[PDB]
């Protein structure tokens, strides 16, 4: 479909070029590449831009990088409807991330619901709301703006 | 009062020696030191052990290091009763940390209350409960255990 350069991706998703390069180096995001040269050689898909938008949003919660990476991996594997363009934003489900003390399973991801979320807080557990619709709305609005 | 070596501090608070060295290097915690030599030369106070316990607990929430450091600085300045041994644990107030998107003020700290905390979650805001009493209880129990 539509492909975007690194500077275009950086400006659309409000990730710095330095962040994109680091996330490429670490395998967080895998844009399409070709041999090195003076011309453009790295291109992000719309799904990559969505992954960038997720990563920037997770990092804005204060969550450490390793857990943001783990969250993005879990979202892409377990919640692929987030990246599908199948579900219109009105029907996407809001989620919540619950960090744990288990190195093997360091992050729980669940559907958001107020009763369970408030119960977790009253037990002393950190809750990180993750509004799937806002994610997709934010990229869509950055992109509609991007042309103009 | 009582002073503890780095290995004693590491084992009491379940921070690795590598973490203590890094937090010393960065100024997170400032144990008492003297000139270098073959003998012991770094000593943690009970208040330092409390600061270590806070730092290990904040890092367990998933909060990134810079914000844990900022949280510890804000707690020591704004909530010195946490480190005073004034308030018995039964009267210490539970808190909550709310990470923000402002670089100048990247973290809000507030008294915990369920109504406000649930309202923040429903608005999409991350909430990190911080149980002051559990902090002081945990070190006290690690220390009562430590002798035996
Ligand atoms: N919100 C909080 N603020 C401060 N300390 C906390 C908070 N939540 C948990 N802790 C501390 O984290 C440690 C582990 O807590 P948690 O209840 O998850 O496990 P635990 O009860 O030690 O596990 P186990 O059931 O295996 O003994 C405990 O020492 C607890 O005091
Ligand atoms: N829980 C969440 N999940 C996903 N995206 C979120 C969540 N909370 C906030 N955002 C996104 O973070 C960005 C900033 O949110 P916030 O409401 O704090 O500020 P804002 O409304 O952009 O600020 P202003 O009032 O200055 O325009 C928004 O794009 C919003 O969509």
Numbering used by the authors:
A (entry chain A), B (entry chain A): 3 to 150
Authors' account:
Here we characterize the MerR-type transcriptional regulator Alr3614 that is encoded by one of the CAST (AnCAST) system genes in the genome of cyanobacterium Anabaena sp. PCC 7120. Alr3614/CvkR is translated from leaderless mRNA and represses the AnCAST core modules cas12k and tnsB directly, and indirectly the abundance of the tracr-CRISPR RNA. We identify a widely conserved CvkR binding motif 5’-AnnACATnATGTnnT-3’.
CvkR consists of a classical winged helix-turn-helix (wHTH) DNA-binding domain at the N-terminus (residues 1-80), a dimerization domain (residues 81-132), and a potential effector-binding helix in the C-terminal region (helix α7, residues 133-150), in which an ATP, used as reagent for optimal crystal formation, was bound as a ligand. By dynamic light scattering (DLS), a ~5.1 nm (~51 Å) average diameter was measured for CvkR, consistent with its assembly into a homodimer of ~54 Å in the solved crystal structure and the result of our SEC analysis. Three antiparallel β-strands (β2-β1-β3) and one short α-helix (α6), together with the equivalent β-strands and helix of the other subunit, comprise the bulk of the dimerization interface. In comparison, the mode of CvkR dimerization significantly differs from MerR-type regulators such as CueR39 or MtaN48, which assemble into homodimers via two-helix antiparallel coiled-coil (α5/α5’), and is also distinct from the unusual MerR-type TnrA/GlnR family regulators, which form homodimers relying on an N-terminal extra helix (e-α1/e-α1’). Therefore, the pattern of CvkR dimerization is unique among the MerR family members. While the nonspecific hydrogen bonds at the N1 and N6 positions of the adenine moiety, together with the unbound triphosphate group in the putative effector binding site, suggest that ATP is not the natural effector of CvkR, other nucleoside derivatives might be possible candidates. However, subsequent EMSA experiments showed no effects on CvkR DNA binding when such ligands were added, indicating that ATP and its analogs are indeed not the natural effectors of CvkR.
